């Protein structure tokens, strides 16, 4: 992993990042017992392997807020720690891989079209979906699950449309008996995320979008610990007489 | 290590610390290639065990600047990563433990008195000295050195005076082929400290002081990478006709 940044830019970055922190210590009168605790917690983050967690919850929102200024298409959001590459491909209309345990849960049917800025249909266009199960587990992040459970690469047809069936997600709680959750708990916070789909959407000759979609009445909707939920990405699914929840949603892709 | 801080205070602390950083990302337009690099570097700091180094160089100065508001005695400074407790005791006038390799170097003779705010003499009063050798190594931080090389606990007499002989320190360069030094080097900085004595000074019924002393014409004197050098802590040693450098310095101790 490399940035291709200059020493001039880094220097300016670190000066005000360090200036900022050093400024919070002065402003609040941070003591020496406090400093020791802090240092000890940074070691633990590393030792608990919680660096992508902590940063993704607490920092990635600004990185996407920056990228967000540059694009005219669908609203993006943070990737989070759990994306996996080359998930198995599925046809234009499909079901997401899932176990019998998953078959017990109210289904979600997710339809729409991948278009360009003008609104034209895009063939040979892909939707990478992934999200958590009713337990708040992600596959490849819990040994009891099959390695592509609720992950897939959806191949959109002739005109960019896709119809995808999966389950309807339940609120993810981030891990707590570790440094990130001890961080939240010592400040009387809450370790909850909204229920969400993660998606990378692409198509030839387009700047991909990475985003999330959420659910209209959901808990933790206006208190996302990751600060990653927007108005523009909240679905409002209607239920069929089959009893399955139904949503349509379209992705608008910028020029690459 | 425990602070005894409330959730209210921590919450306020983390809000503006996180707000601050998130504010630097927005201000500079930090990209996604940049973010990956950053995250990867935080893992390495941990994995290189460079957390007390990085923080002590870049952060501890504000913690002491805070404590500095509360005290009327000698000017303090940052401890740094290398203090060791219960170094062996020596009488009021002594020499610091050192090898034959150390005996080759111009000697430093360091005299003075530990007093109170009014200026009265303090018996049963201690000076913990430690510092680096002409190589820029600290004992217990390089396997080739004897475990108390240039460390000791000096026992001041009847009236708080001490006379201590050691070597005259050479400029410490912090480690470079690791994350902290790759941090400095990618921004065209310099990994140099001034030459310095570390000292903890105490006496019964007094708030100890932790500080450093530096040398009047030294290199890196106005570009200390740790930002830890003050005007008030720069010695000006005269050389004897024995050829040994001579300094007197007195420590003024606040009520505990
Ligand atoms: C108190 C806790 C610490 C808080 C953090 C404060 C410091 C903030 C700035 C530190 C950023 C250090 C990341 C870059 C250093 C490593 C560069 C490097 O060698 O990576 C190299 C690549 O070389 C580079 O990419 C040059 C460095 C560019 C990266 C700088 C962008 C990261 C800035 C993030 C700032 C976020 C805070 C605002 C990997 O190939 P080897
Ligand atoms: C991008 C990189 C990260 C940058 C850092 C940003 C976050 C800054 C604030 C995080 C401070 C977290 C330290 C306290 C959490 C652990 C508390 C804990 O469980 O320690 C416990 C003790 O419980 C406590 O002490 C309560 C927490 C008090 C410590 C809070 C003071 C540290 C603030 C330092 C802020 C410096 C930046 C300004 C150890 O016993 P078990
Ligand atoms: O499931 C998650 C866990 C932690 C952070 C984010 Cl952004 C997630 O989506
Ligand atoms: O020797 C040192 C190395 C790193 C930081 C400080 Cl403050 C030192 O004194
Ligand atoms: Fe998630
Ligand atoms: Fe030092």
Curated annotation (Swiss-Prot), chains A, B:
Tell me where the signal peptide lies.
none
Q: Which Pfam families match?
A: Dioxygenase_C, Dioxygenase_N
**Record's InterPro entries?**
1_2-CTD_multi_dom, Catechol_dOase_N, Cchol_dOase_actb, Chlorcchol_dOase, Intradiol_dOase_C, Intradiol_dOase_core, Intradiol_RC_Dioxygenase
Give the cofactor note: Binds 1 Fe(3+) ion per subunit.
Q: Which cofactor does it need?
A: Fe(3+)
Which keywords are on file for this protein? Aromatic hydrocarbons catabolism, Dioxygenase, Iron, Metal-binding, Oxidoreductase
State its Enzyme Commission number(s): 1.13.11.1
Substrates-to-products reaction catalysed: catechol + O2 = cis,cis-muconate + 2 H(+)
- Please name the CDD domains in this protein's record: 1_2-CCD
A GO biological process of this protein is: catechol-containing compound metabolic process
Task: Tell me a Gene Ontology molecular-function term this record carries.
Answer: ferric iron binding
Q: Which SUPFAM superfamilies match?
A: Aromatic compound dioxygenase (SSF49482)
| Protein family membership | Belongs to the intradiol ring-cleavage dioxygenase family.
Protein name from the UniProt record:
Catechol 1,2-dioxygenase
